[PDB]
Amino acid sequence: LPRPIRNLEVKFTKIFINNEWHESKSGKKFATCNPSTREQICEVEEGDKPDVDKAVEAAQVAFQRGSPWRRLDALSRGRLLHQLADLVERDRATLAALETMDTGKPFLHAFFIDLEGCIRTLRYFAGWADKIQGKTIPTDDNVVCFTRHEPIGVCGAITPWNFPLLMLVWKLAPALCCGNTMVLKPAEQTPLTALYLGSLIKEAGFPPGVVNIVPGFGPTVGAAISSHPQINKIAFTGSTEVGKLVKEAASRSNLKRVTLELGGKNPCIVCADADLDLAVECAHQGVFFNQGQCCTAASRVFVEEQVYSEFVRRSVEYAKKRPVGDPFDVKTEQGPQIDQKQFDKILELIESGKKEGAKLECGGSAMEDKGLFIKPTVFSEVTDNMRIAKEEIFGPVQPILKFKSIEEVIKRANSTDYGLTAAVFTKNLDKALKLASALESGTVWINCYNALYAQAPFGGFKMSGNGRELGEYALAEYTEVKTVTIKLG
Amino acid sequence: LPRPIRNLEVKFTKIFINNEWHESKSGKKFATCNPSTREQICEVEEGDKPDVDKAVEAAQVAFQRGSPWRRLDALSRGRLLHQLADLVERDRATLAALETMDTGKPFLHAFFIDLEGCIRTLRYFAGWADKIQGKTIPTDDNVVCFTRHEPIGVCGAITPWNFPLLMLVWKLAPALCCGNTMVLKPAEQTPLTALYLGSLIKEAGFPPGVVNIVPGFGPTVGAAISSHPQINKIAFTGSTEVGKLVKEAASRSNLKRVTLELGGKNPCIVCADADLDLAVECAHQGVFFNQGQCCTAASRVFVEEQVYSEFVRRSVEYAKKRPVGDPFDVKTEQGPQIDQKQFDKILELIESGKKEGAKLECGGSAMEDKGLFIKPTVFSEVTDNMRIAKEEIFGPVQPILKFKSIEEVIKRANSTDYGLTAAVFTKNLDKALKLASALESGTVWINCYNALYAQAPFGGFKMSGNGRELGEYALAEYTEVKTVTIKLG
């Protein structure tokens, strides 16, 4: 096991433009606090519109025809991404420590989940750089028609606080492998791993201006990015409300292309013929992983009437044994909730459950008067019209609903405006394939949960997003198609 | 040559929902007028939000799982599209006459160009129905991972007045070949061919509610479609200003996926080593086709200094010989402009050209003071700062600019916020390929103009659009990617 770094000193706190470190134009700074201790970690430069303008101009200059970045052969862009993945692997303990300091997630989770995802995503997209191919199209005997899959240009990336470095790498890996340049804005709550990655980008050998990073607030830096007349594309991960604002500002300004990865109201469907212990364990991790603060969280667990009581009973036994505490401690599986606004949000919904007719089975309150920890809560007798089944709790609350037929559970699972993920538990071939085809979700897991791969696309149907991240499909978000049609005389 | 139908009676004027004809909920109607005779053709039902709600509900019912449309095997949707193409071919003369009546374009142009494009586009996408394939993705030894390219659902289509049936078919062909259902809104100026197509959809055997058509105005029907919470996707062709409104309404409502095909400020670059006579004929047709009312029209004809004077001279001869008149006459190459608003706007730009210093070579005024005809106009000595070089004229005006170097003409050609098409005329291999690569345009034509194929994608860079129409690329706009990941026990 890797050794925890409980007293790490943050070295990168400035704006990264043209492979150099800058103070904010205004001189302003903001603090980042550790969610576990509530103490301040350091001050970071606070970017605003003038810093975004400087970053966008550097990105435009690095993308211009004839630039060192544009002149690189396709395989050399792949080599640079592999060199960046080598550095991320070398500095893995430090990156995971900065992520634990900023988010409060357990060190071993940051090391084995977040950082593993970063390295695998970088290596996967490094291999696509010389494999981005257009088409030769047959038309007429005297015509040569073909398509070029060109880089779009300057790409803005806006990410959230729950998986800071990972959500940034899901955009940076395909963007760079396609030949674009970038302006990144990490969440104000979690700027540290992004700034450290800036140092590795320069060390890997990327030409100045290919990646620029401006820390700051959403309505200031984020809005300057979404409305910028010289940013050609934006990729956003975060809340549905902010995703709508970003896509609106992008449309209002220069019609820049927009990828959105938003929340969900993700269902779990457990059939009577499932391996019940597998379904209980997967639905447990689905609800309680990352303190419930994950876009993939299960918000509705639909269980067939035949196994309903036994599923509730075994779920209650699993929720009580979860170790909660200090993130840097090896035994810890659940750290604190990011902030007071999140901790109070989760606490307010549990009361509505008991008042609407649902039976509280376990938990239902905060852990202790010291940190932002909440007790794993399970609810039975949940119905569709209830608040705990209609709203994204983003906390450790497991609502268990009952169903009788496949057709009925398909209608209920799809009765939401969201569609990010779904998980089905059954040993039956026909039920598994029928549910996988019928569920309106970007990813359908069968007999598993949270099984992500750099090679498999991920994203939402309906209001859970626009576009896909990961897989070959991610490349379509970072390229522009040009048709060249030549008529021979 | 097909005989001109100079006195056709219009049979289809109503709202088309569930394969039936309906009066508008308000009882209101709007007139459609022939721009050549300036007489009213007929009155069409004027839809509003209640009519759109009824059409979306029909499209939703036709799309629900288990419906006749959803149960059709892939090859059967292709058969339906070929049966529609056969009906469009059978009624080709009537559709072309309806298009000439509504738009003023010559009857032989609507017959051999617009209608040929419709038939070719329907047959091309009919062949894609059983060829839309997802992927099987290698992951781990105990995992089966694959993607499904599912239909998105209810698709809205909003089209302009310059190529009414064709812009509609460009959306309808891929949408239906992917298994979607639709709500169509033709332009208020040109509703006739869309309504006639509705009668062909019912005769072709499409189940009720697969295609619904609501004629009406933009801020009423169009805005009800763009903001609808049960429309999953919208494809829009029209002005950049309205495209922005549609995309903002889409983001604000339900994050429906959006395709935009907007205007351009398209450059046509004529090098000194070009086949000069081919470049003159192509740039002439490229400016003057469809009365200059084409999104592909050359807004800037850049000619190298070495051939500038002879290019201008030969272009004037072409412009002076272009037969302008009654669109139903066999000799007519140019009919009237669409309406008074467009006619006055073109005349305003012609006066601005004179007042800013451009040399008027020919035309420069209306034909015979009464009709909506404008004399084919050529301006030489045009510079980049002039209005006739910056603004999309959408009329029969050819502005000829001079250039000296390839690097300079690339900079000038790309200095626009648009990027729909570009054309290059040169006999040199290196010049042609360097220009094809450097021009920021969705289609680059070399030694040809307006060379479109159902199999070659078309769309804009920058503010000329998002997404592509035609080719295999059109399918990505009408399908939603689903990852199914199965872990074997």
Add this chain to the structure above:
Amino acid sequence: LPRPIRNLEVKFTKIFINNEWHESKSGKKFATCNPSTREQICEVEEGDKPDVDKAVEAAQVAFQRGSPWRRLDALSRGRLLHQLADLVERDRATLAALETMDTGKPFLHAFFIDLEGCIRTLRYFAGWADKIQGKTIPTDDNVVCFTRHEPIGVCGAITPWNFPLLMLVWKLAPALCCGNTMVLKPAEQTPLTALYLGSLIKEAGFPPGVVNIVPGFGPTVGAAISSHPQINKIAFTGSTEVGKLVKEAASRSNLKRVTLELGGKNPCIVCADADLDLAVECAHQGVFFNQGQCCTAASRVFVEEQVYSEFVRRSVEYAKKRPVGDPFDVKTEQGPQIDQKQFDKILELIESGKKEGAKLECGGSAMEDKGLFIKPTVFSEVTDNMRIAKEEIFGPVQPILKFKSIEEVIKRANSTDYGLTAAVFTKNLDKALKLASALESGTVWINCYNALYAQAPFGGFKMSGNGRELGEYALAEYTEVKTVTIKLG
């Protein structure tokens, strides 16, 4: 139901070259007999090496650059294949009658199976003609690299007697959609449907020489095709022994490319959790369809010990109720075996079963002293080392083997040098996917049998073949890849 044509007169009996009908150069003819009556149907021209040379020269002239066939736009080749499918549909009753006359298969089977497959294959490949796309490959900043998927040239097609027209269309549809020209050789036992198709090829409008047909014997016409120095590719369907000879002669002569579709020793695997009645019915059709004379025939039915006796019992009940008789009679599900050599081959293997320890359950002898009919036979207690489990019977004999575990049945099912098809029956998701991944077969059917689609590839692993027919994969057999690499100065 379509009316049978019990007294049809054959009109096409000559060699088809350059869209004209020719006598053989030698003047020789051969007879074709009806397998049901044993009577002679007609005499057909007997081609030899001089007729093949004439056919190959016509095919070469039709394929030369600048020819009408080579000049056709991609979409027009698709239109020709659709016109040929329209004619095949129009003349469906006549084609099915000629196939029943030549093969002895029931008229309704020829009409609803063979002819349906022909029409679907033609329509599917008609849609690929304008969708055969190569790639644009990223290399260096100063290089333009792309691939062309060109037609190979003159394609020879050699087919067998069991599905005459269908096996020919599986080659002709992709070959023509890719732009090649052809020399066809149907089996000497079944020349009629191929010659009738020649008349429809000319009527559809294919230029002369694009398709040429030379009836005759294998060692004469077939060998002249496989060894021809001006045939660029051959596709062969038939016995493994003849497939090896064709591939050897192709290699010895000019290294022409070869696709082979050969026999199999196809397994059926029925798990204890299968829908037993579905498994019994599918394995019945698998063994007894087309009198057992099908490349997809099940030669080994592996049944899990838990359902073994019940599977044998229900299989015996199904085999006794099969209606055998006159092919043109509506109630007939089984006609006669093609010839005496086939009828005697099936009769000799049943004796070996009883002598090696297998229990005969039903049948085991000829039907009656009048025609070439054999009684549906079922064997239980079959082992791997027995002759009825090791040899392709090509007749109505169902050997039922017993198994205990999945790992064991995978090893046994794969212990053959063949690998054409396999079928698995189970309600369990994991067993279905594990068996589908582990079985070394070109097609794995799950809970079905003989489910072919024009869009799904078909072909063998190991000695069951080389290459694939059907699906997008068929196009790779009929195209040659050319890389064009251009360096810009």
Add this chain to the structure above:
Amino acid sequence: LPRPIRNLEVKFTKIFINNEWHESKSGKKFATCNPSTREQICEVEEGDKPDVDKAVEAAQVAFQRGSPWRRLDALSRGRLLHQLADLVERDRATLAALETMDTGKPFLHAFFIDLEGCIRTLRYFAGWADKIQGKTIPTDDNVVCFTRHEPIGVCGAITPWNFPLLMLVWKLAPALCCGNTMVLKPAEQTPLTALYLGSLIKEAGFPPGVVNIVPGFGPTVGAAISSHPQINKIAFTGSTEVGKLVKEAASRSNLKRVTLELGGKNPCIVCADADLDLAVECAHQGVFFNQGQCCTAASRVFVEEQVYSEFVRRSVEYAKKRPVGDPFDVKTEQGPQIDQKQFDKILELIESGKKEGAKLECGGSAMEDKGLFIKPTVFSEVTDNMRIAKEEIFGPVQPILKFKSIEEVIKRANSTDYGLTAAVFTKNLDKALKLASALESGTVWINCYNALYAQAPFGGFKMSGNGRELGEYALAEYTEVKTVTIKLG
């Protein structure tokens, strides 16, 4: 520049099976000699059929389901290939010195050309391992149809003496990225780099038996591989005559799939409008690279009459200045020929050129009567009927032919039974594209020569080969297509 290793000791001389070194079963050894010093380098174990049987059994065991190699996740096979490339880069100087010792090619050519190709090819295919994707195919509403691109199994590789390590890596890289196991046979003249690669395969961490190497002769080891009943695929690079033998042995044994990369009679077409100095330099390197012992060598340099005399003149100056000598010297551009047999064959062709009427411009004899060096030879006034224009010389001889029209040079260039490569030199767009389309060659270079990329396929038309190496196309040669069709109840 890397320092030349003039006195390297060879460590690896044994048969490599299961990551261990073995003496031959017979105890026999064969010598390898340095063509520059004409002294023996070392003795290598001489394999025969017993050694091949042991290597195939190891490859089969390494390929069986459940083996460590088969259980590796897709991304892990890519990591192994990158680790092998890192080891080839680390030992680049030693591999290049071993290649120079065995072949006589200049040390800097083996270092910057052969070894660079090896590393680039390994890294390109390492990136394909997690990107080999099959398809999900739409069929019927109740059917799930998909393809898997499975590894073929045991692959044999037989390579020639002119680019020993590179031709091996071209097969090894895609074979292992697809999950296959291998038996390799390097040429008897050049076994050293293949055996050194074996030590790198074991050090890289490949499980035992994934790669096995059996040095030896063609009719013994090579024929045992081509005829082996447990080898599923063979890739061969070498002469057309031996390729025919291998393909016939493959057909006669088990129908193993075959790839052939054979010789060519490659045309190099220089138009009057070419950049003459570029065409002279390219055609010079294209004939003389690797002592003229390249499959890509121009066998016919066709020059348009307008520039014929000046082309000949400038080519003579290049040929006279080419430094011939000790391959380890930095200035050397041409080493000795491979052996006495090749050396005498080249001298025989040079005499035949003189006796048939070609004008000897320079060279025409051995360098200094003792060594295997031949003076760079240029012949003008060459005609199509001459031996030096029909036969693959495989030596430093440039035959320059004259042409007058494009149509005539297309006919003459395509009149061969071969079709590996072609090169065209012209500044005209139409001429370049018309020639690229009309030349029957697997690779057509325009204004360049020997421009190979790991991402661009390479292979022959006609008798120059079957299949492609490099690019995405290489994967189709190392995978077997499986259709899985599931019918839902």
